[PDB]
Amino acid sequence: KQDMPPVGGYGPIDYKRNLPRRGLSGYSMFAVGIGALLFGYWSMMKWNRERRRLQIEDFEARIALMP
Amino acid sequence: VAAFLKNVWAKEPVLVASFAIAGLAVILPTLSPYTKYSLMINRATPYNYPVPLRDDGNMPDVPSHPQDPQGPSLEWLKRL
């Protein structure tokens, strides 16, 4: 008399197949790429030109002496 | 030819991006006035020694005093 089949309690689990967790698509990408890229170029011309100012300063001490 | 940019950018999207960097690179050095500031600096970098010359009568300009306003003005860069 002690056999298995239970009265209730069932799901089931799915046979489904989906995980569309997107994801900033469709022209939202290529937008964070370009602006941060020119931001790095914007970081230039305030350092290389600044080091160029120090570069003439470095060559200044050479020319002032040597007579 | 209007879909020709939309039947290869959905077909081979690698060299299409190369030709756009082949473009926008040849054209722009002839466009913005930030160039020729590249030329004014790259000539005004003193390597060698500026040797003075001999006076005889003239004197058109530039006496012996270095801190006199007697030469050019490249001092815009320090103000820049």
Q: How far apart are CA B77 and CA B71, in angstroms?
A: 16
Q: Closest by alpha carbon to B71, among B47, B44, B48?
A: B44
Q: Closest by alpha carbon to B74, among B36, B35, B34, B41?
A: B41
> Which distant-in-sequence residues (6+ apart) come within 8 Å of A11 by Cβ?
none
Q: How far apart are CA B50 and CA A60, in angstroms?
A: 12
Residue located via tokens 């790259």: B42
Provide the resolution (angstroms): 4.2
Chain A residues whose CB is inside 8 A of the B45 CB are: 55-56, 59
Residues 32-61 of A with CB under 8 A from B: 49, 52-53, 55-56, 59-60
Q: How far apart are CA A38 and CA A31, in angstroms?
A: 11
Interrupted backbone of chain B, residues before each interruption (C–N > 2.5 Å): none
Q: How far apart are CA A46 and CA A39, in angstroms?
A: 12
Task: Name the residue among B45, B49, B80 with its Cβ closest to that of A56.
Answer: B45
How many other β-carbons are positioned within 10 Å of the β-carbon of residue B2?
Answer: 5
Chain A residues whose CB is inside 8 A of the B46 CB are: 56, 59-60, 63
Q: How far apart are CA B19 and CA A33, in angstroms?
A: 18
What is the b/e burial string over A17-38, where b = at least 16 CB atoms within 10 angstroms of the residue's CB? eeeeeeeeeeeeeeeeeeeeee
Q: Are B16 and B9 in contact (CB under 8 A)?
A: yes
Q: Which tokens is B60 given?
A: 């058109």
* DSSP one-letter code for B60: S
The SS3 call for residue B56 is strand
| AA letter at B7 | N
B49·A63 Cβ contact <8 A: yes
| AA letter at A55 | Q
| AA letter at B20 | A
Chain B residues whose CB is inside 8 A of the A66 CB are: 49
Identify how the structure was determined.
Answer: cryo-EM
Helices (H) and strands (E) in chain B, counts: 3, 0
A4 inside 8 A of chain B by CB: no
How many other β-carbons are positioned within 10 Å of the β-carbon of residue A52?
Answer: 15
Task: Mutation target for B interface from A56, A57, A58, A60: give the one with most B CBs within 10 A.
Answer: A56
What is the b/e burial string over B16-47, where b = at least 16 CB atoms within 10 angstroms of the residue's CB? eeeeeeeeeeeeeeeeeeeeeeeeebeeeeee
